[PDB]
Amino acid sequence: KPINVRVTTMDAELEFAIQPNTTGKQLFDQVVKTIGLREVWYFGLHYVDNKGFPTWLKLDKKVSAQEVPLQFKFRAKFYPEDVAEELIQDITQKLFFLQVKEGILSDEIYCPPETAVLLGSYAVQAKFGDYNKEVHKSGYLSSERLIPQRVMDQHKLTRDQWEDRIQVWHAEHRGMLKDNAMLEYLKIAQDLEMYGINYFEIKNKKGTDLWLGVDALGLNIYEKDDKLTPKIGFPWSEIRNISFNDKKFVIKPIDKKAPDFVFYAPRLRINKRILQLCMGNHELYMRRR
Amino acid sequence: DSEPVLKGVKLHYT
Numbered sequence: 001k002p003i004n005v006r007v008t009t010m011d012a013e014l015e016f017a018i019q020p021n022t023t024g025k026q027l028f029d030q031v032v033k034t035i036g037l038r039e040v041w042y043f044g045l046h047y048v049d050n051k052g053f054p055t056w057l058k059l060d061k062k063v064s065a066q067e068v069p070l071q072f073k074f075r076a077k078f079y080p081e082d083v084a085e086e087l088i089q090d091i092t093q094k095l096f097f098l099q100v101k102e103g104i105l106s107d108e109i110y111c112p113p114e115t116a117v118l119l120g121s122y123a124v125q126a127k128f129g130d131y132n133k134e135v136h137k138s139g140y141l142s143s144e145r146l147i148p149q150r151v152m153d154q155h156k157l158t159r160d161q162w163e164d165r166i167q168v169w170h171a172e173h174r175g176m177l178k179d180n181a182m183l184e185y186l187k188i189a190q191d192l193e194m195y196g197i198n199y200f201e202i203k204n205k206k207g208t209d210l211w212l213g214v215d216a217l218g219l220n221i222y223e224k225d226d227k228l229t230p231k232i233g234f235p236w237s238e239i240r241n242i243s244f245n246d247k248k249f250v251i252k253p254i255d256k257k258a259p260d261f262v263f264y265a266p267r268l269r270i271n272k273r274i275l276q277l278c279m280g281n282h283e284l285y286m287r288r289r
Numbered sequence: 290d291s292e293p294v295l296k297g298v299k300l301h302y303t
Contacts, residue, residue, distance in 0.1 A: 012301065014295060014297065023291070030295065
């Protein structure tokens, strides 16, 4: 019985026929070969196909175990610590650039206003080349989404207002090739507080709603309203152990005097997804060292 | 035998 699956990358869509004994790895490997991606360890096959949960597919398990064409999103799952130092291929860099830009523009990654303008200008340099008073004049940037909706909502400028501010930065990017404009975009984005972080809805022992963030450097607890500023930070080197059992997850600090952090997930599968990102990020962190 | 079979592709340039 053939199963229809769609995989989308940030600038491609692929439709596949797979059998019930096709592995996640066979799907992943044919995606990466089609697009010519070598730096595979950053990436994964995403799917909101739990009974409602955002998840990452397992490569050494048959696709035919967890399911909501079957829809998959080929996306970066782990983020480098330093984008300029670590991303080797232009394709890898482009795929991060597009994924990160979508997170910013969709309001998912908070962005200050002047940063949004500057980022938008690099995106403009990447999509349009050098600004030319001849080629790009009045309204060259209408029809273009360049600033997050929450930035515009909180501010008092019109669309032409915004294009104008972006246009004055575009011109300073004369001589910048596209690939380099995409990296400069990432150099700025990777300084944003929400960049590169996987957020999970958790509760402490008192029943307060919190966020857990897992990122390349460790674990963070946020109050429900402040996803930018970690309330509690757990860098890998400050963790004695991490554990879960069903819905209960515990972080034990290296400081024998300091107390455990205990929180609760809504289901077992959430805690499993948290720990796999924990393991994946810790291992990449150790591999860099 | 279990290897996926590509039936469709869309590539966005811009």
